[PDB]
Write a protein that binds this ligand. Sequence first.
Ligand SMILES: [Mn+2]
Ligand SMILES: [Mn+2]
Lengths: 7, 308, 388, 582
Amino acid sequence: XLXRXXX
Amino acid sequence: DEKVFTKELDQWIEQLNECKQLSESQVKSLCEKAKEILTKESNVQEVRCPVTVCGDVHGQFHDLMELFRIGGKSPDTNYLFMGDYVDRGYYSVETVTLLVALKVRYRERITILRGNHESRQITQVYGFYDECLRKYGNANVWKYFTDLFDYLPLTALVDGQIFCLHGGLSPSIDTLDHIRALDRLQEVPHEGPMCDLLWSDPDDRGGWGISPRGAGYTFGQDISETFNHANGLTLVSRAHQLVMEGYNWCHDRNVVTIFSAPNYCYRCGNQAAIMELDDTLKYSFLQFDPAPRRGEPHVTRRTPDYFL
Amino acid sequence: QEKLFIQKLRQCCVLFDFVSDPLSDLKWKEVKRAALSEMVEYITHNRNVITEPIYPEVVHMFAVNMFRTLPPSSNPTGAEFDPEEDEPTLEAAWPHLQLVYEFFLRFLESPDFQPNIAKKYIDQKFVLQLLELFDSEDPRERDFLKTTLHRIYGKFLGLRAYIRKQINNIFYRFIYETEHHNGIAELLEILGSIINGFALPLKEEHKIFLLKVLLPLHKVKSLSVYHPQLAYCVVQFLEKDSTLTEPVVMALLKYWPKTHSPKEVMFLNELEEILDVIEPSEFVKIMEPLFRQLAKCVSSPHFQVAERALYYWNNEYIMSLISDNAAKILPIMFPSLYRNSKTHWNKTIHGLIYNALKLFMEMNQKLFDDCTQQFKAEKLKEKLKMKE
Amino acid sequence: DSLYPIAVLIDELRNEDVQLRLNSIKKLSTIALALGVERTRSELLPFLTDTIYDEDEVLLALAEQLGTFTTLVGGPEYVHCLLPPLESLATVEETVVRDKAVESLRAISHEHSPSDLEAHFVPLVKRLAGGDWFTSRTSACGLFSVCYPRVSSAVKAELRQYFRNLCSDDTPMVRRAAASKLGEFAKVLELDNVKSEIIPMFSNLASDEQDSVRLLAVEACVNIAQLLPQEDLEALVMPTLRQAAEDKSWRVRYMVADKFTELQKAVGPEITKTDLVPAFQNLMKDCEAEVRAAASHKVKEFCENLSADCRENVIMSQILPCIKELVSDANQHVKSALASVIMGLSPILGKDNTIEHLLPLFLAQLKDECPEVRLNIISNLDCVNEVIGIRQLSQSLLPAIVELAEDAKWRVRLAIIEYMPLLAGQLGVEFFDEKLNSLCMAWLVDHVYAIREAATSNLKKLVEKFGKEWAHATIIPKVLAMSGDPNYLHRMTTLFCINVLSEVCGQDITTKHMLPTVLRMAGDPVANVRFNVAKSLQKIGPILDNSTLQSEVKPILEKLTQDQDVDVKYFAQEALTVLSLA
Ligand SMILES: [Mn+2]
Ligand SMILES: [Mn+2]
């Protein structure tokens, strides 16, 4: 969930 | 002449094991020696089993270390990593260097493939570039590695039955001969086959779709079934997306995803896993938590970001 | 009837002491949610204008509910982490709090409710303990603090000093001791207003604040968290007084990130914003060392940087400024723009660069050619000769 | 043969190109050398003194450098020449810089003659102490302890004042500093001054608006307590320490907890029983886990240091009861913490008590959910049998120790595996064989290598305990029925053990029951086993008799030098080179 490129 | 250097490597490795980076100099040489070995390798690498397949590591050096505790060490056990060595972790450098160091050394005991992150642009947006900066003062190590990446084989086939790749399937690719044709020696494109093999994901929506990521597509079960049959494949081994359980089966156990970076980014909280393919291609999964981190020194105040 | 300034001054003390520990989910008997939402609606909906009797038990009530010692963080150490990616931790028992805040707010933000009331029951100590609270519950709690402090600042001239001083302390400790605090952003927003509205001729102290506290703040690793809120203050400061421009720009360069591309772009992004308001007569004092830097950015192997810098060229006001002084600037950038743009791994900057060179010609043909002349020449010798 | 390059550095000391100018500065020690000592004083330092570089990175260097110029400048007679630049460097905003600045000042302070101390160093401290910027004052704090003891009475006097003014600075940032240094300063003040000057500053700081200052006061408390005689602790210290323990800020309580055993000593054996024991209880019951855990870690050490005459008792009536509660604490780390030291109370309470009071808790921990807890408990069973019986051991404890030998988390299985050899010889080979040998053999086949590895190692330790004959009659066998496993991973484990057992099984057993299987395994279809099978021969090499070597080893080792596999080929030629078989 950190940024879609991937948490 | 042989040992003359083979000892130089053997040491480099042992140093890396202490998680101590190699010098800008050494990195350049290690990579040189590396290209020469990686060129000879096809885009669809032929790896004979037994071997253990590993997924994402994302510079989490220690968990990589834990990984070896779980599946054995090189070269006593044969490995296969499906890209994504750098970015996110706090030790991308050590991680990648060590893995590459082993390839140069035990050339037939480990197999490294390219990942969506073994790209100049991503490494620049997701860490690696900066880490190399703070660990070397300039951009040379970064260049030297990103350059080596290009020569990484895009895929690998295990015992003619298992297809291993970082990303996924491509509408631009139907047979393994297709991949073989491709010219991989170049940065990962924003569009195309090569890019697909590196960014595609399996979807629960059946049939080619639009990747919510921004690259590659989202293939469905039918697509997997089709592909496997057309090439004589029993398994599509890939990993490119966090699976809170270390590994996950999809598309009627036709494709399995395998992540090896526990508690990814030190946040996610997933378990990691690896897959062992024995003397006779038998599945077998080993899950594991992130190793325990220990450090009693005085956590000082880091040197300014404007230093240099 | 008219016996409320004893019923309320009791309906409150009920909510005061209270302090129902919400870390076990037991004793589910509200009670307080009433007395609170009650004392609110009792002062909001035209329910009063005469409830100013001498009773600052409102403060004490608030103090005993809010002034607790913030708990140990539930987020990781640092260095290997990014606060931007911290898991938001909500203060359990927000309900009671929320109301205590919301109430207290409307409390002294109502007419008839004078300052000289609190002026003696809202001392530095109150302020101080209030500041500490600026530390963890998602905006939810910080936000209220943010607003609460703002008004307390605007209503007591006999406090403004302290509020400011203390905030500087909260900042110094941030910059030079523990490179961690959870509400710099919120605190900056408050300051934004404060800055924007000083004496026409800036008082010595305020300049110091900007230089010894505001600028050195760009220094920290967690800038990606309050960058915008900060830049605003930096700009707002320049608009108040342009003089402080040279020192400001100089400082930013002084602190220019060398191992943090993100912050780099942030700097670049914050620099344009300063140029947009840069007074012509001053674009000069900075001009040279600034561009001397931009030339280095454009050549950066880091696309995002090179790019963001290159983008300075679609800004009319900057291009304007670069023209009115093209003489000194062009020779600074040129060597980096004319530099074989065919080298980059990112087949997108060459064009980006070209666009920039181009814009220079349509600004002064002579110079350009003259610079190209020099470049080509010097490049020959150093090549003809540098080959033995 | 040239003095040019060094001539260049001195030149680039003003190149206005950080990159370069820095180099010169980081090499200042060599400029100064080839410069002269008299030139250093007359030219270099001044240049450094009147050139206010901006770059912190440069300044940082300049500061670290001047700390070594004690000689390069002309010896102690001229050490006081290095002060100017440092003094200014001590004011740099960027701490790091001014930090080095002080490290150095402190360093070269000792090279100063008392006479020069008073003449130039102290004045630098005072100036720094009176500065407008907190930064300056901040630094000043660290310079007191090093110059105070060697100066005059009248100066000490002034110094004491200054330091007091720092403690009461209007900036938390400074007070925090004054505070940190309050300890080291007391160690140099005469006893009385401690009583009349430190004590006040001590409590004053111990109760500052800023909790981030008060907690420091706590540490300093220790040092101060160690300076006063027993009699005077109840009058000048305790009142504060007692408050510290109850402080509203959990951060301050945490300190008292974290330096507890440290206070335990500084204070004395009496006040401890009197004031601390009670205090220490409250800390294990603190509302903040962070704190409870902190106190837990001290349980063992705090109890070991109790006055000889009361120990067994208080532990039993005061400490022990909390421990039971802590064993059930909701917070992992707290549980986890106490599970490491708890076993230490064991030999203090003696056999009887241990079995009645601790053993249950131990048992409780061997079964917690949190691995860290179980893991931490297992690791201390090496003793217990010295306290409880060898029967009690195998009676209420062995069962868990067996269950644990297969709990989920491998690191926990590892711990048991590490305990075996001990727990093995203690119970006796006869018992081991009956119901404990099967586990040791199973781990030899665990999924996670880490474990199988430790299981292999485990075997050598057992053989040492039970005898080579026992190995050749209980282990060697099953260690071979392994080379017949489809998985090369497990098949390799065989050579791995042989690599170990050999060391201690003897030329006979080795050559008569292992070397065979090693040779037989040189035909494994998997390179891995083949090259490891080669590696094994290089290990059990020297153990064999030259007859068996150049006759049954070399031959099969040769056939490997000519193998299709790159590595197998490598380890073979290697095995030879060392075994002098070529
Ligand atoms: Mn990926
Ligand atoms: Mn990935």
